Ligand binder design. Sequence first.
Ligand SMILES: [Zn+2]
Ligand SMILES: [Zn+2]
Ligand SMILES: [Zn+2]
Ligand SMILES: [Zn+2]
Ligand SMILES: [Zn+2]
Ligand SMILES: [Zn+2]
Lengths: 84, 85, 493, 166, 76
Amino acid sequence: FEVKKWNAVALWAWDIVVDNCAICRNHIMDLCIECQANQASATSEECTVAWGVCNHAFHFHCISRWLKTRQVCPLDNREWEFQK
Amino acid sequence: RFEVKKWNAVALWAWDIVVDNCAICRNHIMDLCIECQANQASATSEECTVAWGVCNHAFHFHCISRWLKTRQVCPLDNREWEFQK
Amino acid sequence: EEIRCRKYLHPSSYTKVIHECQQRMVADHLQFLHAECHNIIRQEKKNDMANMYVLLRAVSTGLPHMIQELQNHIHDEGLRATSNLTQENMPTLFVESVLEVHGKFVQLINTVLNGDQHFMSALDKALTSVVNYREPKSVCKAPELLAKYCDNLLKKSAKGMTENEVEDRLTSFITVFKYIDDKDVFQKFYARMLAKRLIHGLSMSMDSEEAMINKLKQACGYEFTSKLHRMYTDMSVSADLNNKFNNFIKNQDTVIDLGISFQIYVLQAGAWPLTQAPSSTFAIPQELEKSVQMFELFYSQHFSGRKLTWLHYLCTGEVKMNYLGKPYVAMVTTYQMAVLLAFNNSETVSYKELQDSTQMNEKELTKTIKSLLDVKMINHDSEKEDIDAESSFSLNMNFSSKRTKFKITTQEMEQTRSAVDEDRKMYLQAAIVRIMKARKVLRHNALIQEVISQSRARFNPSISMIKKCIEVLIDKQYIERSQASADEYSYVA
Amino acid sequence: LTQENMPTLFVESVLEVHGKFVQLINTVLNGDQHFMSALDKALTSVVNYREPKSVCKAPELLAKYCDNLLKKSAKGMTENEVEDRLTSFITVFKYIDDKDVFQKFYARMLAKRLIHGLSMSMDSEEAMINKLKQACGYEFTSKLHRMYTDMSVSADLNNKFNNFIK
Amino acid sequence: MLIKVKTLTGKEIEIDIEPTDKVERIKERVEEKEGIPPQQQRLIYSGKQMNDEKTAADYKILGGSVLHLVLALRGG
Ligand SMILES: [Zn+2]
Ligand SMILES: [Zn+2]
Ligand SMILES: [Zn+2]
Ligand SMILES: [Zn+2]
Ligand SMILES: [Zn+2]
Ligand SMILES: [Zn+2]
């Protein structure tokens, strides 16, 4: 089969910067620092984005650990609640 | 003896693990610029100004200056840059 | 014609005959009516406006020209009522003028023009085009002015507006606020000027501040007021933090004293426009290091994972005199207190020797010492003009203050408000006699209109205060009232 | 309301209610600011109505209403009619009191309305985004306005890339 | 040349006239920011009052200063 044309959407951000899970102080694309160690224990699939009202991006482990003893986003002191 | 009566001071708090950084240089916003801390620390230093613009982001003066050499937009939200708070 | 067709025609053709009458009596003469439109709407002839609207809505392409003419006329009345204002009282006059134009034209459209939605949209668009009227090659002058207006309506001024009155006034403020094109700049001034009100204790009442903050939350999205709201919901808990900190003092782990009231106002570093001081590093005065470190520990254990920065920049404190006589309660910025503390240590004060104590930049240290010597708290022992590294200082005993708790520059607002109101009356004294030098006789009610016309670009004059002020010219033998006609007036000159 | 055509009928109902009442305010009661503010509060509680212990419907419903208005629909709604509706839409939109959520629902269905070409016309969304910033500020409609510009640039970048072929 | 002339309540007057200008038109702008008409304020230059053109260089060419104007009426 051949394709005459196709529309490819792409997302671009400046490579010097990157959205980061500041709780683990690592890349969103990269892993959280607590699963950076002992990485053989967990498959690290559950280290995804937890989008919410704060409109930030985090590793799920880091934000969930923060919500274990806190109740606010670690960038703005707003009531954190998962959205996506 | 001048004895103080009352002190209505203030304080600004941020979560320690979450450090605001100049996104170009990634260093601590109160620390030196990436080129200030590596190239011009000995010469002059004390010149890594925390720039604020209509973008209302956090920047180092040298970082944003080298960013503005070949473009005009803020490297966190792609607005029009003014560094005028 | 409609009566005739109802009387003589079957109803199934009622609408056609009236439609066909219009397309032969008010549509084919559209050039005549549309040429008249400019005059018929410019002089606000209300009966003529009503007839014009009832006869123009019928024609298909009849309304738009009148829409455009109303938009232009409202634009002109906006500029004429919002230009060459006094720089002294610009914000209140600006907001009041826009509210007056808006109210009068809402009255005109939705009582005489029948309040068609097209006309209301024209009002909104034109008045938006005037309440952001930039000077050529200049930034828009609306956001800062409305920020100043709100910041004057919220301060504890001597006006003393009642709570219901201030709520109604702030609803009107929302009405005039929904037109500024760059609302982002507006909350950039407002956040800066809400910082002043919630850190110097100048808010009239936290109820009013909460009402205003929450009132922006329905005219703009919750994201728009997130920076604004997080300040108010940080001062309202800061006092509780002072209570909890004093309770932590009451733990009495050791014998602890602060020698000070120590009211603290921790603020959220993100949403507070207070700049994290790039320069002017500071070393805390030794009289207060213990309190600083104990507060740091209290904010550490009782609230984990938190880092302070001790923004001395805006830190305001007060200190008692060193028994120099006439005991005054001296309140200074913490920049000034440390310098004057090292001054208290020894009468001879060298600039270089106080560099070590304060540990700060000289460019604002000179400003602090200059402010100290402006009220002559400190004196320059050397007679050289400015302050260098070798400037000498000592105590100026002979300076006296009429107030013990005297103020260093940042119930006196009552006197200033009366003086401003006096100048309003003083100008009104200097407005009456000009008409007397123009026609020498005017009616009681006709004189009031001339006062407002003379003060069109100035403050709005009160009708009752005219009567009280015009009697000042009577007993001063300037002007007099005719016996036969109370409206008739004359002057001796 | 009929759930198949809930958004447009909802907006028409609330807007006609507001119009009738605001006409009644000053044609009869001289138009005090008190009564206008009372109408504001009342219709604010009206359009915000929700089933208890459940999410609200106003942001999603008005997002879908503006999607209907800006959709390239077969009904042939003209530019003047849709722009007049949007100018009327802002009056309803002011009463939501939860606007930032509406901005998120609108933004998500703008990506659907942009890549798939379902937009009425790329010069008609400007009459919508710039009609929002004037009523909610610049940080409210900032994500939207970076999206809409990308269409009128990347497409140009298309001709700036095919030329790179040559 | 900005003006900081006081008034009956220590108010401000914005003449914005250089010392080469005449007080016949310099005092016009000073009272424009105050409220009085130009030909009504008997401006006193700390010891003398303006008359005719009254070029501002005659009054020591002071910059701003404190010109305590007289608010007498019927002077037009
Ligand atoms: Zn993480
Ligand atoms: Zn993980
Ligand atoms: Zn957040
Ligand atoms: Zn940097
Ligand atoms: Zn640098
Ligand atoms: Zn940015």
